[PDB]
């Protein structure tokens, strides 16, 4: 409603870097808000794409940002009569970034890994990896929970159980308020998808450079399955956290599985032991239900609500014809110990191929009326197909069915404006929460400042 669409702020990275593929707000120890920006195709040392991370100080003018430096060198360790190998070429560092406390977590979901033992090998596969930084101190750490040293022949002899070689850890990411990093790994367990959680403090305290294979004993991984409903489900394509079981001492996870059950799609709510509490099934096959998930209380009853994006939902139209426009589903959490019911509200895009629902960002309370609000992205929506971000305001019965404000992409065609969103943070300290919108196609981020209504 009250986002300023006139005076924007633009940050930019190198060309072809996909600057703005992922973003997040970051507060330093003094509470000063910055913008961490992932650029997963930034050139590395050998003039080869490896990705990169930028930490943008808040300036109304915007401009260029300094890099958040990470080790981009391939690693080799000869230990235990084996050879450990990391491969950072085209690893996509910055395909996801997330900030918690004074720590930044930037992940390379396509970092490859291999283990050589004489003539055999584990196979060169994208286990993924995440990089952690404490910018004020310079502390660095890594976390790659799917790295293993099992040779390929063993996986064959054991029928490919507990096969984490293609995890792509850090594909999606989120950190609990207690400081527990939760990684989405959609390729884990032979493309079923898994989750990897470990306290940030323990990641730092157990990491040492050059080890490549180390234990984080406090970590917790989800489980393999023989149920074909989960095969190729990409469990962990998106992840989020929230409170859904009434016990404030436990944190519940929200996992998107957009191809669950033969591409029907699903979203599951689980406890910290990965025990399933709720499952929301997709409405339409191939709609990619669960591509994005958001958790925020929109109707002001103190109970976290769930939002699910299905950006490829095909709406029915006259003469038995379908039109892909995307759809967003709102699930209000019922009072007390009960199951999430049917969707409370359906938001459906209008622009063909607009992919409405590709990203859903909680905004906090934008207009300061007492109800939290959201922004939904249609990265190829709008009458020109350049992309649109639509704001929906919360209300006592959930959400408004019509947007309060629409942000048309300021970038050229193909910028994917809205592919990444982040709100609920006041960056200019005016008392109003603001919205940052990534447009990796144009290698830029736009900042929308909220103003008095």
């Amino acid at each position, epitope marked *: 409603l009250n986002l300023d669409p006139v005076q924007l702020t633009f940050y930019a990275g190198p060309n072809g870097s996909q600057f703005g593929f992922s973003l997040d707000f970051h507060k330093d120890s003094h509470g000063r808000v910055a913008i961490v920006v992932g650029a997963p195709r930034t050139l590395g040392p050998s003039q080869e794409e490896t990705g990169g991370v930028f930490l943008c100080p808040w300036r109304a003018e915007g401009g260029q940002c300094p890099s958040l430096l990470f080790d981009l060198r391939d690693e080799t360790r000869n*230990v*235990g*009569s084996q050879t450990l190998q990391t491969f950072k070429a085209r690893q996509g560092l910055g395909a996801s970034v997330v900030s918690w406390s004074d720590v930044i977590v930037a992940c390379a979901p396509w970092q490859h890994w291999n283990v050589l033992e004489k003539t055999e090998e584990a196979e060169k596969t994208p286990v993924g990896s995440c990089f952690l930084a404490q910018p004020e101190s310079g502390r660095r750490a890594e976390y790659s929970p799917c790295r293993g040293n099992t040779l390929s022949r063993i996986y064959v002899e*054991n029928d490919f159980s507990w096969d984490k070689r293609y995890c792509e850890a850090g594909f999606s990411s989120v950190v609990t308020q207690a400081g527990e990093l939760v990684l989405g790994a959609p390729g884990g367990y032979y493309f079923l998808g898994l989750l990897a959680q470990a306290p940030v403090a323990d990641i730092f305290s157990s990491y*040492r450079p050059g*080890i490549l294979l180390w*234990h984080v004993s406090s970590q917790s991984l989800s489980f393999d399955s023989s149920n074909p409903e989960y095969f190729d489900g990409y469990w962990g394509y998106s992840v989020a956290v929230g409170e859904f079981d009434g016990d404030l001492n436990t944190t519940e996870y929200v996992v998107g599985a957009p191809t669950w059950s033969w591409t029907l799609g699903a979203v599951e709510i689980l406890d910290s032991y990965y025990q399933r509490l709720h499952r929301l099934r997709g409405e339409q096959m191939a709609s990619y239900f669960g591509h994005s998930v958001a958790v925020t209380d929109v109707n002001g009853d103190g109970r976290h609500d769930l939002l699910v994006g299905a950006p490829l939902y095909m709406e029915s139209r006259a003469d038995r014809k379908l039109a892909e426009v995307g759809r967003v589903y709102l699930f209000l959490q019922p009072r007390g110990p009960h199951a999430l019911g049917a969707p409370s509200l359906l938001l459906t895009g209008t622009q063909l191929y607009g992919r409405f629902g590709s990203a859903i960002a909680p905004l906090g309370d934008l207009d300061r009326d007492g109800y939290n609000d959201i922004a939904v992205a249609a990265p190829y929506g709008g009458p020109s197909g350049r992309g649109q971000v639509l704001v929906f305001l919360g209300q006592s019965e959930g959400l408004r069915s019509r947007p309060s404000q629409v942000l048309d992409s300021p970038f050229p065609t193909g910028s994917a404006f809205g592919f990444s969103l982040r709100g609920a943070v006041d960056i200019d300290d005016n008392g109003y929460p603001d919205l940052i919108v990534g447009a990796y196609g144009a290698n830029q981020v736009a900042v929308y400042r909220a103003q008095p209504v």
Partner: antibody
Framework: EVQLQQSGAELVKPGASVKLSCTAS????????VHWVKQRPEQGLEWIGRIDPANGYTKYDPKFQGKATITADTSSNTAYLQLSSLTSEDTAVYYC????????????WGQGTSVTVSS | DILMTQSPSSMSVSLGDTVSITCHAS??????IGWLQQKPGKSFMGLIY???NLVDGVPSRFSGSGSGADYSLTISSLDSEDFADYYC?????????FGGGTKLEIKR
């Protein structure tokens, strides 16, 4: 806290067999490798082998191939070292070892099980 | 197998001294070495892993160094508890192999 609590001292006859135990305390035995190390005053420390309790895959020094058999039961959170066809030279102290962080390290040690072979 | 020649077999020193134990391997092990401590009549305690990294709970007066096939464990300012046996172990190759050992004894 990580603690490896081994079995009591064993007193056996030559030619017999003995099964030493190493129980995980404060952690899951399935977490890391579990090794076995033999110690003698003259010969010193000797690596016997290792097991991955998660799957039961083992490695051995070819010296102990035949006498030493390493197993593990995740249920009881315990690793085992079996010694067959005992000899006076098998009289030694035996330790179970696991790493702290580095997958291949040798950092945490049980108190040690004394073994004495005699008729 | 990789032979680990640890030197010296023993040393007579006093409190506060700065001593260094060396360990030589028959081939390059690229910092894949650990240092161990065995107090008299007791079990073992991990000191160093991967050449230079301290085990959790170990005082900083301990430190590991070296490269290739030559490594060193240094104890700055000896404490009354530091008088014990010390061993180096390589895990660059299987089978793991240990050094002969080093006993720190009180000088008088």
């Amino acid at each position: 806290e990580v603690q490896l609590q081994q079995s009591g001292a064993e007193l056996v006859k030559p030619g017999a067999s003995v099964k030493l135990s190493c129980t995980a305390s404060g952690f899951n035995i399935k977490d890391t490798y579990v090794h076995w190390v033999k110690q003698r005053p003259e010969q010193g420390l000797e690596w016997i082998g290792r097991i991955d309790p998660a799957n039961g895959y083992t490695k051995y020094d070819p010296k102990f191939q035949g006498k030493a058999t390493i197993t593990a039961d995740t249920s009881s959170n315990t690793a085992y070292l079996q010694l067959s066809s005992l000899t006076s030279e098998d009289t030694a102290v035996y330790y179970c070892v696991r790493p702290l962080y580095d997958y291949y390290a040798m950092d945490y040690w049980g108190q040690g099980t004394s073994v004495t072979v005699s008729s | 197998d990789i032979l680990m020649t640890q030197s010296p077999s023993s040393m007579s020193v006093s409190l506060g001294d700065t001593v260094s134990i060396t360990c030589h391997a028959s081939q390059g092990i690229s910092s894949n070495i650990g240092w161990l401590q065995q107090k008299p009549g007791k079990s073992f305690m991990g000191l160093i892993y991967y050449g230079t990294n301290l085990v959790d709970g170990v005082p900083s007066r301990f430190s590991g160094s070296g490269s290739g096939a030559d490594y060193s464990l240094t104890i700055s300012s000896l404490d009354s508890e530091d008088f014990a046996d010390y061993y180096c172990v390589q895990y660059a190759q299987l089978p793991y192999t240990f050094g002969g050992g080093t006993k720190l004894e009180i000088k008088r």
